[PDB]
Ligand SMILES: CNS(=O)(=O)Nc1cccc(-n2c(=O)n(C3CC3)c(=O)c3c(Nc4ccc(I)cc4F)n(C)c(=O)c(C)c32)c1
Ligand SMILES: Nc1ncnc2c1ncn2[C@@H]1O[C@H](COP(=O)(O)OP(=O)(O)NP(=O)(O)O)[C@@H](O)[C@H]1O
Ligand SMILES: Nc1ncnc2c1ncn2[C@@H]1O[C@H](COP(=O)(O)OP(=O)(O)NP(=O)(O)O)[C@@H](O)[C@H]1O
Ligand SMILES: [Mg+2]
């Protein structure tokens with residue numbers, strides 16, 4: 001029923017909380033000091049024992065992770081109703097901001113390299129049986145060639161969907177969702193019971209690959225209902241309109257495959273990415 | 278496309294909008310919730326409706342938003358809700374407009390059982406002439422006609438609202454809501470080129486929903502149509518795209534009305550009736566030359 005901060009292998013004496021780093025839908029993220037750290041404060045119901053034990057299950061999972069392309073989970077302290085997760089702080093900017101910066105050049109070699117970094121991180125997480133469930137460019141950080149994945153697993157416990165008989169959909173979300181998931185969204189849908197899988201993570205990486213080359217999300221023009229229908233029936237863009245070769249488009253054809261079993265693992269994807277010009 | 282009494286009311290609204298000059302937060306005192314609020318301007322004795330769209334982006338884009346929104350000062354019609362001004366306050370852009378004491382046809386249909394055919398005829402004329410006005414004098418399509426955006430008053434006017442004037446406001450909104458009732462045309466769902474035909478489809482679907490008292494997709498079985506007189510978003514959308522369109526029950530509605538909606542609900546937008554074809558359709562020629570006290574039915578049903 002309790003998670004203390006002395007339960008962790010990172011020795012902890014004091015924790016300072018600084019300014020808010022940015023807005024977001026799941027808790028608040030502050031600057032902190034331990035070196036500098038990122039502290040995500042989350043609120044839960046006073047006595048929802050169910051989800052609390054689910055949460056501890058998950059963060060006990062996170063305590064075993066360490067990998068250069070994965071944000072360092074440093075500790076988590078629970079004490080209801082308010083819980084906090086403390087991770088390492090990422091220098092640099094999100095991939096989201098970098099992609100949308102006109103002064104930044106994104107040649108095909110550099111995009112292939114960024115993709116390979118993200119793929120290594122994701123394959124590490126998969127090998128430990130951890131699904132991300134919210135892979136996207138706002139959850140990847142880029143600092144002069146160093147690429148780090150953050151916020152893995154949170155989506156299960158997130159509550160970012162929460163009007164009456166109306167599901168709240170954030171821009172950018174739907175185009176990362178594999179068809180199997182898109183075809184199940186409802187106003188009754190709950191984050192903890194959507195059919196996430198390794199294949200849906202590979203799908204989201206495919207969406208990231210598109211965004212890396214077009215420098216915008218797919219389906220940018222279209223409203224949400226159109227996106228749901230088009231993706232659920234399997235219509236997907238390509239990159240020929242901007243002169244990308246066949247090889248850069250085959251990554252999309254594979255990662256976005258309609259039937260899950262046709263999508264590659266991150267190991268196979270790493271191989272496919274190595275063989276680009 | 279001209280009347281006198283309407284001219285008078287529009288002149289009066291122009292006179293009124295002269296009163297306000299400029300707007301800012303403290304001018305307004307919250308009266309009630311309608312997000313949209315019924316509010317009282319203090320610099321001028323007006324009761325307005327103020328809708329607050331929460332946007333969180335840098336000032337240059339919001340300035341572009343207000344520049345684009347200023348076009349509504351220019352559009353004026355008896356079939357368009359009145360616009361007064363748009364300012365920015367505290368991470369929310371405000372649109373203040375004429376307040377409609379009858380509300381949207383969504384909630385009037387919610388309180389009534391079903392809306393009778395002749396009133397639906399009147400509202401059909403209102404909507405078709407409003408859309409024709411927008412297309413012909415401002416080269417804009419509404420892009421979001423549905424019951425909640427059609428407004429009614431105790432004086433008896435029916436006008437369109439919440440139509441698509443600003444592309445940048447479409448871009449700037451962070452997140453949308455998708456429920457169990459879609460009014461998007463099949464061609465828009467599929468991402469092909471579209472025109473005001475999509476608005477005509479949305480109007481048809483709204484009309485059949487209001488006439489039957491139930492959102493008509495999926496169509497009800499014999500049991501619920503008898504008594505009248507758990508679905509995932511994707512399969513509703515796929516029904517709209519691939520199943521034959523809804524249709525009125527053949528017993529309780531006129532041939533003209535049935536054919537009017539059927540012409541609105543044709544899937545191929547090229548074969549779907551256009552604005553003027555509907556302007557000359559039998560159903561609205563019949564409804565045009567009728568005397569219905571819309572204000573009376575309204576007030577009696579809503580208790581106003
Ligand atoms: C889902 N289809 S979509 O993805 O393509 N997006 C989209 C499409 C069509 C319309 C809008 N839309 C809109 O829904 N509302 C309502 C918030 C719920 C708008 O108020 C709105 C708008 N304000 C506005 C203008 C005049 C009056 I008189 C009153 C108003 F409230 N203005 C200026 C717009 O230009 C658009 C384009 C609006 C969004
Ligand atoms: N380790 C970190 N280092 C630096 N910034 C971080 C870190 N973790 C989170 N942030 C920032 O904190 C803010 C909130 O992030 P978050 O709560 O995850 O929402 P988001 O993923 O950015 N957007 P959304 O998916 O709609 O919730 C963003 O500006 C992030 O860039
Ligand atoms: N000028 C107005 N006069 C009267 N009621 C209004 C006015 N503007 C908005 N409303 C009401 O405010 C409520 C909220 O409408 P709105 O913000 O448009 O969301 P919605 O109706 O639930 N769905 P949508 O219309 O598609 O955004 C509805 O009940 C409208 O009828
Ligand atoms: Mg994040």
Ligand SMILES: [Mg+2]
Nearest residue numbers: 425426438439
């Ligand atoms: Mg509305």
